[PDB]
Amino acid sequence: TTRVLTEAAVAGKRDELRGLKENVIVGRLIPAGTGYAYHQDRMRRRAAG
């Protein structure tokens, strides 16, 4: 963890919460199974705003 954190802070990267573990840790619907449609709708509405 520590080296990854240092590298991210050095580079200044953003996650966008695309991995399943991201939705797990934040605690939202993962883009798989039943929540796939909701994730797709969220991605679609993100295009317009």
Binding site: L20, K21, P31, A32, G33, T34, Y36
Partner: protein, 589 residues
């Protein structure tokens, strides 16, 4: 993070309580669904205040039990094994109240949950939202999860008492009471329960009304008078209409019942095969309990020529030690051919064993010499496969064999005994090395398997289905594995759950067998096998050009369904877990 509605229940056998059910002890109840009890009490006008509801719940009145029963009656519940490896370690069931304190688990799902009815703790979970109940009902029920997500073979593999009893009642000594009787098929049980004939009766003629779906989408009746035994006759009333009578007319081993369930699933469907398995297992419990199937010291038989074989082996050992003393033979050759002679003696002992335990028994008859399969218990279950194997039985009647391995070597003199005639001190002292090595291997390799599976899940989690077709002709080449002495696996299932490309061609020039995008559901395999094709072009996961996940047009199904995989299903989670699940590998080379 800790779980709220959960914890530490014990496992018991559910002979009753069919698959879509489970037994939740009542003392565990009334707590998990206490908010539901409060809601029902307020809705029914039984508690104007929450404190009244709390006091009456704490006092445990009969009306409280009635409300519990009314609310739990439509509320499925989910169960989990604490050490879990694959998807079937977690399944959902319908709770049933039983006055005890250990949850009743069905015998069949025991294989998936990998339990053993020893000291174990189950994790119980309640989904509360309507959607979560629905998600449990639609995907995590056992009735739907008949097949493996790993290979395709059915996880539900009935065994033990059920297979032993079924194999027993589909038998005949030579001819039981009332051999020549003829009846229609329902009367077989009518006369079996009361008097007149035994289930071991053979040469019985019955009129069987078979039903076959020859035409498209409908079955036609067919009647026949084939000769059949009693157990098959009474088992025919339990088999549904679709299946023929040939499958139920056999010694009916574990593979027989396995392929029977496979036929019922593929031909009839989900619910027919589920109810078929349910009723089969009920028959298994009933007939095993009716059969008896006792065991004893004399049930096993020690072959007599074992002493003669041992004497000849000892004479050979005396000869070889004399030869070594003569100086003609070196030491390594001496050990090696001592091992060879002892292995030959072991093989001969095992052969005399199986001969004394095989279909070698005389029954009274006009010819007075009728050698039919004996009814010894150990050989019975070995043929059936209920529990144990002929390899294990070899250690019970004949000799153990060598069983000599301190670290890597093999000791000269093997162990010559069985658990009936006793065993010596030094030999038992030696024999523990393999046992302790296996124990150490298991205890030190479960952790390695767990870490391997963790690594696999972490590395293959981002995979998901998000696109339909890749529109690419690139694919992997699939051919039968032709190496070693013979073929290890023919081109039968490597393309079963796969989709062919446009590169499939007939052996004849300017001839085609199937168009580009076609799924080999169940019959194209036979067509391509008839053409003796060796090379098949099938798009793989890497072959598909999508730049994101894997499209469904290159993966097939490989699931307990009958249709192509749908969008949103996470193959990567489906993958990376089946591979390391069989953590029964070997360590220390």
């Amino acid at each position: 993070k800790r779980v709220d509605y959960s914890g530490r229940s014990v496992i018991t056998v559910g002979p009753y309580l069919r698959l879509h059910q489970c037994g939740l002890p009542k003392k565990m109840a009334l707590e998990l669904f206490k908010p539901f009890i409060y809601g029902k009490l307020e809705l029914r006008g039984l508690a104007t205040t929450i404190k009244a509801a709390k006091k009456m719940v704490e006092r445990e009145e009969a009306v409280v039990w009635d409300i519990l029963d009314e609310v739990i009656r439509e509320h499925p519940v989910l169960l989990n094994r604490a050490p879990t490896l694959h998807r079937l370690g977690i399944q959902a069931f319908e709770p049933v109240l039983i006055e005890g304190k250990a949850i009743q688990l069905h015998p069949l799902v025991c294989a998936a949950y990998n339990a053993d009815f020893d000291g174990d703790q189950m994790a119980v979970h309640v989904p509360l939202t309507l959607e979560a109940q629905l998600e449990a009902r639609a995907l995590m029920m056992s009735t739907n999860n008949i097949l493996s997500p790993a290979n395709g073979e059915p996880i539900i593999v009935p065994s033990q008492d059920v297979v032993l009893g079924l194999y027993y009642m589909t038998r005949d000594c030579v001819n039981a009471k009332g051999e020549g009787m003829v009846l229609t098929g329902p009367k077989e049980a009518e006369r079996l329960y009361r008097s007149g004939l035994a289930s071991l009766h053979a040469r019985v003629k019955v009129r069987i009304t078979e039903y076959e779906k020859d035409a498209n989408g409908e079955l036609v009746a067919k009647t026949s008078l084939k000769d059949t035994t009693v157990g098959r006759a009474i088992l025919w009333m339990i088999v549904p209409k679709g299946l023929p009578y040939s499958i139920v007319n056999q010694a009916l081993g574990k593979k027989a019942i396995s392929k029977m369930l496979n036929t019922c699933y593929r031909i009839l469907g989900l619910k027919p095969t589920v109810i078929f398995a349910d009723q089969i297992m009920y028959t298994g419990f009933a007939y095993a309990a009716r059969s008896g199937a006792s065991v004893g010291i004399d049930d096993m038989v020690i072959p007599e020529k074992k002493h003669e074989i041992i004497s000849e082996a000892e004479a050979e050992v005396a000869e070889i030690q004399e030869q070594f003393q003569s100086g003609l033979v070196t030491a390594g050759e001496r050990y090696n051919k001592v091992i060879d002679i002892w292995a030959a003696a072991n093989d001969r002992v095992s052969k005399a064993m199986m001969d004394n335990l095989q279909t070698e028994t005389v029954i009274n008859r006009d010819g007075q010499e009728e050698k039919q399969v004996s009814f010894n218990s150990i050989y019975m279950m070995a043929d059936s496969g209920a529990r144990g194997s002929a390899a294990q039985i070899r250690q019970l009647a004949g000799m153990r064999g060598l069983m000599a391995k301190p670290d890597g070597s093999i000791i000269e003199t093997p162990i010559t005994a069985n658990f009936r005639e006793g065993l010596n001190v030094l030999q038992y002292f030696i024999s523990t090395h393999g046992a302790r090595k296996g124990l150490a291997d298991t205890a030190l390799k479960t952790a390695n398997s767990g870490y391997l599976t963790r690594r696999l899940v972490d590395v293959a989690q981002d995979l998901v289905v998000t696109e339909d077709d890749c529109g690419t002709h690139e694919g992997i080449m699939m051919t039968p594995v032709i190496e070693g002495g013979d073929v290890k696996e023919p081109l039968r299932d490597r393309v079963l759950g796969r989709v062919t490309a446009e590169d499939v061609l007939k052996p004849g020039t300017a001839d085609i067998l199937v168009p580009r995008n076609t799924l080999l559901h169940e019959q194209w395999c036979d067509l391509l096998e008839e053409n003796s094709v060796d090379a098949v072009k099938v798009r793989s996961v890497v072959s598909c050009d999508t730049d994101f996940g894997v499209c469904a047009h290159c993966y097939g199904r490989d699931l307990a369904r009958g249709h192509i995989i749908n969008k949103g299903e996470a193959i990567g989670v489906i993958a990376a877990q089946s591979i390391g699940e069989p953590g029964t590998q070997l360590t220390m080379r």
